[PDB]
Amino acid sequence: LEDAFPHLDLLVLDLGGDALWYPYAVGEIQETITGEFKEALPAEPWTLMPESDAQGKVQAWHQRTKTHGGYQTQTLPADDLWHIVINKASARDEVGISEVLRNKDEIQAFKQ
Amino acid sequence: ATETQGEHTFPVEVLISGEELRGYTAGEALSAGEPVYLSGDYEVSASSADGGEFLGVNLYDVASGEPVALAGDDCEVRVEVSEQVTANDEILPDGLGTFETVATSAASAGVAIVQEGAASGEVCEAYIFAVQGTTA
Amino acid sequence: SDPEYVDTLFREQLLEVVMEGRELRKVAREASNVINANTRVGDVPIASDEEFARPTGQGAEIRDDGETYTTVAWNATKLTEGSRVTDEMRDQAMVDLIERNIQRVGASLENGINRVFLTELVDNAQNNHDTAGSNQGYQALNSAVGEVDKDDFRPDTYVTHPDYRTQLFNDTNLAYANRAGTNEVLRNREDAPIVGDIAGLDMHAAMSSATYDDGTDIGWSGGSETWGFSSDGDKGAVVYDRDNIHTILYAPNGQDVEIKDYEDPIRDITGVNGRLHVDCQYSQGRSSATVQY
Amino acid sequence: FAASDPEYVDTLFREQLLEVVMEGRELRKVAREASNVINANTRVGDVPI
Amino acid sequence: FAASDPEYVDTLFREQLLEVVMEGRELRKVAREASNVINANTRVGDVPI
Amino acid sequence: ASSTPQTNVDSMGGGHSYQFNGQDLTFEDLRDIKDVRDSGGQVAQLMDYKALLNFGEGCEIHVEGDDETKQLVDGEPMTLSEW
Ligand SMILES: [K+]
Ligand SMILES: [Mg+2]
Ligand SMILES: [Mg+2]
Ligand SMILES: [Mg+2]
Ligand SMILES: [Mg+2]
Ligand SMILES: [Mg+2]
Ligand SMILES: [Mg+2]
Ligand SMILES: [Mg+2]
Numbered sequence: 001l002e003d004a005f006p007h008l009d010l011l012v013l014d015l016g017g018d019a020l021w022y023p024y025a026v027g028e029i030q031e032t033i034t035g036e037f038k039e040a041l042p043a044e045p046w047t048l049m050p051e052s053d054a055q056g057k058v059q060a061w062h063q064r065t066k067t068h069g070g071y072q073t074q075t076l077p078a079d080d081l082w083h084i085v086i087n088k089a090s091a092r093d094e095v096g097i098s099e100v101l102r103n104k105d106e107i108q109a110f111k112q
Numbered sequence: 113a114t115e116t117q118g119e120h121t122f123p124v125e126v127l128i129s130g131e132e133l134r135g136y137t138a139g140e141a142l143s144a145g146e147p148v149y150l151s152g153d154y155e156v157s158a159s160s161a162d163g164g165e166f167l168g169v170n171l172y173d174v175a176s177g178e179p180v181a182l183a184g185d186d187c188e189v190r191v192e193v194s195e196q197v198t199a200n201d202e203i204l205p206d207g208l209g210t211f212e213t214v215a216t217s218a219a220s221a222g223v224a225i226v227q228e229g230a231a232s233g234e235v236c237e238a239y240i241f242a243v244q245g246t247t248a
Numbered sequence: 249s250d251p252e253y254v255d256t257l258f259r260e261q262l263l264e265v266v267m268e269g270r271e272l273r274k275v276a277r278e279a280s281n282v283i284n285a286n287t288r289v290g291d292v293p294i295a296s297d298e299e300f301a302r303p304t305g306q307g308a309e310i311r312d313d314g315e316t317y318t319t320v321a322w323n324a325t326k327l328t329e330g331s332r333v334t335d336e337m338r339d340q341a342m343v344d345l346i347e348r349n350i351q352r353v354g355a356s357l358e359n360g361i362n363r364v365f366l367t368e369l370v371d372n373a374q375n376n377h378d379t380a381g382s383n384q385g386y387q388a389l390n391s392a393v394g395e396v397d398k399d400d401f402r403p404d405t406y407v408t409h410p411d412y413r414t415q416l417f418n419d420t421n422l423a424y425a426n427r428a429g430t431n432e433v434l435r436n437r438e439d440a441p442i443v444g445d446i447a448g449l450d451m452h453a454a455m456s457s458a459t460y461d462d463g464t465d466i467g468w469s470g471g472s473e474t475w476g477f478s479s480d481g482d483k484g485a486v487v488y489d490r491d492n493i494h495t496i497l498y499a500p501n502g503q504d505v506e507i508k509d510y511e512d513p514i515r516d517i518t519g520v521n522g523r524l525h526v527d528c529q530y531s532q533g534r535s536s537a538t539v540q541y
Numbered sequence: 542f543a544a545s546d547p548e549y550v551d552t553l554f555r556e557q558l559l560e561v562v563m564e565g566r567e568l569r570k571v572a573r574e575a576s577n578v579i580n581a582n583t584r585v586g587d588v589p590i
Numbered sequence: 591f592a593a594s595d596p597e598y599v600d601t602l603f604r605e606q607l608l609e610v611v612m613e614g615r616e617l618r619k620v621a622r623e624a625s626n627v628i629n630a631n632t633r634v635g636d637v638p639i
Numbered sequence: 640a641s642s643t644p645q646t647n648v649d650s651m652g653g654g655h656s657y658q659f660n661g662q663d664l665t666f667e668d669l670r671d672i673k674d675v676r677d678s679g680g681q682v683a684q685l686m687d688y689k690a691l692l693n694f695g696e697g698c699e700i701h702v703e704g705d706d707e708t709k710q711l712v713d714g715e716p717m718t719l720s721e722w
Contacts, residue, residue: 029640043646065647069627069658072647080640117614127542137469144542154467171542177469179325183542283559288546290557293601297565314593317562317601400566492563531563555604628657 004037011040018045019086023096026061026083040082050083050095051075058083058094113145113192113235124235126171130187133171138180142170145191145235147205147223148182150245156180161207163219166244188227188239197236198229204244211238249339266343272456274358276365276495279405279453280528283322285498288525291319292494294532322496324525327364329356332512332519346520350507353522357505359459361526365495367461367471368528369407369486375399375537376483384412384477384541385419389447392487392537401535405451405490411477412484412539413438413454451490477541488536498525 005011015025027042047065050058061076085096100107115122126145127133139157142148149165151157159165168182169189183189194210197203202222206212214222223242230236255261283292296316304310331349338345375395379388389406396403408416416422417437425431432440444452463470477484499506509520530536542548550556579588591597599605628637652658655665676683700720702708708719 028644028646030644031640031642033642035642038642041644041646044649047647047649063647066649066652067647068623068652069625070622074647076645080645123548125542133542137467144548155469172545172547174547178323181542181545285557287554287557289550290559291600292559293562295562295565298567312592316593317598319558319601400568532566534566553607555607558601558604626653626656629659 005040011042015042015084016086018042019084019096021098021100022046023087023098024050024083024085026081028081043081050078052095056092056094113190115235124190126169126190127183128188128190128237130183130189130240132184132186134168134182134184136167136180136182138170138174138176138178140176142174142180143209144170144172145189146170146209147191147211148180149205156182158209159205159207161205161212162217163204163221164244164246166205166223166242168240168243183240185240185243188237189224190235191224191238193226193230193232193234193236195232196230197226199226201226201229203236203238211236252340262342264342266348271355272359272362272458273454274362275407275453275455276362276528279407279451279490280365280369280493280495281491283494283496284503285322285324285496288324288498290322290496292322292529292531294318294320320494320529320531322494322527322529324496324498324527325364326523326525327357327360328521328523329353329360330519330521332517335511335516335518338518346509346518349520350509353507353520354505357522357524361495361497361524362455362459363461363468364526365493365528366407366455366459366475368530369488369493369536370460370473370475370483370538371471372530372533373486373488373536373538374533376540377537378540381541384415384539386416386421386447388539389416389449389485389487392485392539393447393449395537396487396489396535399534401489401492401532402448403487403489403535403537404449405453406449406485406487407453407455409455409475409477409482409484410457411482415477416443447487449487473538477539479541482541483538484541485539486536487539489532492530492532492535494529494531496527496529499523 002008015027018025022045024045025042026045026048027040030038030041032038043063044065048061048063051060051062053059058078060078061081062073063076064071064073083094085094087097087099087102089097113124113126115124123144136148136150136154136156137152139151139155142156142158146169147159147166148156148170149159149167156167156170168184168187169191171181171183174180191203192210193203194206194208194212195216197211197213202214203211203224203226204214204217204219204222206217211224214220221242221244223244224238224240226236226238228237253262294317296318299313302311302313329352331353333345333349375392375398377388377392377395379391392406393403417433421427422433422442425434428434428442430440430442432442437443438452438454444450446452457476460473460475461468461471462475474482475484476482497504505522505524507520507522509518511518546554650662652660652663655663676686702718702720705718705720709716710718712722
């Protein structure tokens with residue numbers, strides 16, 4: 001595992017940072033061409049939102065990204081993405097809470 | 113009333129804008145875009161000609177005794193006219209499910225103003241601005 | 249929130265209660281077959297009646313007389329009730345106005361279901377027992393069961409007016425423990441187990457007087473009968489097969505009544521609204537008899 | 542108007558049918574219990590008394 | 591006659607409605623790729639040339 | 640899984656054109672950084688203190704199992720750390 005994740009200290013700071021800013025950190029598993037594991041690769045969390053089922057479990061990820069004066073859009077299955085939630089409404093919540101949007105009023109009061 | 117695209121015929125959306133949509137009982141079978149008036153206590157029926165009988169336009173087809181949604185004042189609507197109409201014409205119920213101009217009718221005041229002109233039997237776009245009831 | 253008055257301790261406070269209004273009896277969900285429909289309009293298919301096999305010569309062709317079918321359509325109507333209050337009322341109220349208006353809207357929809365059910369049930373029953381005064385108690389229930397049995401259906405339920413209940417519990421069959429085999433009616437009146445187990449019927453559904461659609465209420469156009477048991481020609485009970493009268497409930501969200509609290513985006517109004525769609529239809533109206541005064 | 546279920550009732554969806562079919566009137570059947578049943582060997586016959 | 595579709599097409603079953611809506615006419619969209627796109631910070635303005 | 644990323648990235652657009660974003664900066668913006676750095680005063684001194692805190696104390700090179708690397712480089716042994 002220490003060779004599978006050589007730079008885990010940097011990954012933990014990045015993912016943990018994102019998971020405090022955004023409702024979740026989110027990413028892929030990536031392979032070498034030979035199909036051996038390369039890395040867990042974080043995606044840009046502001047570009048992605050989860051499609052939950054009726055019982056609140058994430059089934060797919062919907063992505064929107066800037067491209068040349070407009071946007072690309074795609075959907076990906078939850079089968080080959082992972083996501084981590086630090087802040088929650090309940091222990092059953094897979095979508096999570098942004099502390100920025102939670103404290104939006106206090107942030108704006110400060111800036112004003 | 114109907115729109116054509118290629119081989120296909122589509123129903124027109126009767127309502128263009130407005131939130132003044134209200135509920136009544138149908139006193140008879142009614143068709144989308146027909147003008148209606150109060151035939152009884154919260155009951156509406158198709159308007160006859162020459163004024164005094166208009167509350168709004170029926171928004172979708174209904175059988176007798178069913179609840180009906182109606183667009184009243186402050187609504188822009190797509191409605192069928194029995195004669196050629198032009199922008200700024202005042203129009204009112206024709207007694208035939210259509211509207212006609214105030215000018216053609218025996219009445220002196222309309223219920224809707226034509227915003228986009230249309231030929232006889234076509235769909236005009238109009239804004240509803242008045243009801244008419246029994247004044248004697 | 250900013251309350252203009254504080255509340256002190258030891259209940260030296262203002263008297264802080266609301267007394268309830270009249271509450272109507274709600275039974276249609278129990279007293280009928282409930283269909284939770286997928287569509288606001290729909291059909292129940294009905295097969296044709298049984299026949300008798302045909303006498304035929306030896307070696308002759310057998311004639312066809314196959315099963316045939318029709319439907320009864322449901323066409324559910326949106327019942328609605330709503331309320332709107334300014335936010336100053338919400339803040340300054342003696343009790344929670346949103347809670348009270350939610351309960352009122354829920355009750356108004358249930359009363360709505362019961363009106364639709366009772367009006368169908370009373371108007372479209374195909375049989376009648378006319379008491380003509382006279383033997384209005386158990387003998388009328390037995391006779392009404394006889395009228396349904398004579399159409400080859402078996403009823404299992406009865407729906408009853410307050411005036412009819414009053415007559416019935418004065419009946420010597422039920423009022424005397426000797427004749428009833430129990431003193432439950434003398435003691436507990438409508439809560440007696442025999443009242444729900446009489447003349448072969450295994451359910452009693454007690455209605456209110458106001459439930460039937462007289463057409464005097466706003467937005468409602470009345471039924472064909474008079475619901476009552478006070479005067480010549482009133483219909484005061486229905487004896488019927490519970491599996492042959494359908495209450496169809498449709499809601500675009502969930503299975504049942506939908507209550508929405510909301511705030512006006514412009515005007516400092518809050519409201520609560522309730523929706524449900526309901527229809528009521530006999531599968532077999534012959535399975536039902538009214539009792540007439 | 543807008544989009545309403547009475548307009549697209551046969552275009553964007555189909556009216557429900559119940560999958561259960563309701564029975565018609567059924568007559569009471571008792572004869573096989575209410576009488577002695579003879580399985581005859583011949584369509585025509587006699588019983589002696 | 592017997593029992594056949596045109597008799598019971600709304601009483602014993604319901605006509606199939608195909609699961610997919612056919613899209614109709616779509617116009618070609620290019621302006622966002624085929625021009626420089628500026629996200630302005632005011633509804634009205636002047637660009638220096 | 641997969642051998643190439645399958646999530647998109649915002650980091651594509653009309654090059655160094657007239658749009659504004661942190662990765663879309665021009666040579667003028669780069670020279671704007673250079674002007675803040677060049678022009679001295681209190682702002683430059685603070686950002687120099689930031690550079691000195693992060694990197695001014697010097698460095699050390701390590702190799703895990705360095706001694707096992709020992710090899711003749713030019714007629715004389717070195718380890719990878721020594722090289
Ligand atoms: K005329
Ligand atoms: Mg408007
Ligand atoms: Mg139908
Ligand atoms: Mg033959
Ligand atoms: Mg036959
Ligand atoms: Mg009968
Ligand atoms: Mg008691
Ligand atoms: Mg013989």
